[PDB]
Design a protein around this ligand. Structure first.
Ligand SMILES: C[N+]1(CCCS(=O)(=O)[O-])CCCCC1
Length: 237
């Protein structure tokens, strides 16, 4: 009695999404249309299945519960975690991210390593009260900290030369180095690597297999790496 059967017979694929994640899954302000990388992924899957997508709004706090309860067939991208996998299935991953450091480009030879940013003479900008700030204290215990309060942005301090570096997700960094060509990712790998995947019911092997099969097929023609580039996004190796 797999969801695969129900999706094909009904002609409808139900997709749970928060719609508040630029540029993975957003709603267009005026029109209220869903757009973004995960939306295009789901459009392609429904096209290949010969079915229509139904978007089912949810929030971060309930999006996993929407899978467990059967409010939708599949989620948009979420971070795969052991805790989440106790209750939900995940598809294969198509996007790897982690924490990386940003500096001004001109200061690359000076700050080419994590260790170079961990020094009494270096200032690291952080955002006050965040997860990110706690990680900066872990990675750069010898450095001087500039902890600014939202809405002030940590990266703006780096732009202004008031701090030498900051850290953020590779996703955000990729976006920032696009917008501010004067910035660069310190090329010394990433910390706390993690993976985005779609959730499906933990108890429906047949549907889980079907989506993984489709992902494998798409990967063989570079579909996801091309779609990531469409959005100027890039997966870590
Ligand atoms: C970066 N992000 C997504 C995190 C989603 S997670 O699966 O990791 O729980 C964007 C939207 C709000 C929440 C934070």
């Amino acid at each position: 009695e797999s969801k695969l059967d129900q999706i094909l017979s009904s002609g409808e694929l139900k997709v749970g999404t928060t719609g508040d994640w630029d540029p993975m899954a957003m709603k267009d302000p005026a029109t209220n249309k869903y757009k973004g990388f995960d939306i295009d992924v789901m459009q392609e899957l429904a096209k290949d299945m010969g079915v229509k997508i139904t978007f089912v709004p949810t929030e971060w706090k309930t999006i996993v519960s929407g899978i467990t309860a059967g409010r939708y067939d599949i989620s948009t991208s979420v971070t795969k975690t052991p805790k989440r996998a106790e209750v939900a299935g995940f598809t294969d991953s198509y996007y790897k991210y982690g924490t990386v450091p940003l500096v001004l480009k001109k200061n690359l030879k000076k700050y080419s390593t994590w260790k170079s940013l961990n020094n009494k003479d270096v200032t690291i900008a952080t955002t006050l009260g965040t997860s990110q700030e706690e990680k900066a204290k872990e990675f750069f215990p010898l450095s001087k900290l500039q902890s600014v309060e939202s809405p002030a942005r940590d990266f703006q301090e780096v732009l202004a030369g008031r701090a030498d570096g900051n850290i953020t997700s590779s996703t955000e960094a990729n976006k920032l180095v696009v917008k501010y060509p004067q910035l660069a990712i310190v090329p010394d790998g990433e910390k706390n690597p993690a993976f985005l995947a779609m959730m499906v019911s933990k108890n429906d092997q047949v549907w889980n297999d079907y989506v993984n099969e489709w992902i494998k097929s798409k990967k063989s023609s570079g579909f996801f790496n091309k779609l990531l580039a469409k959005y100027n996004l890039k997966s870590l190796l």
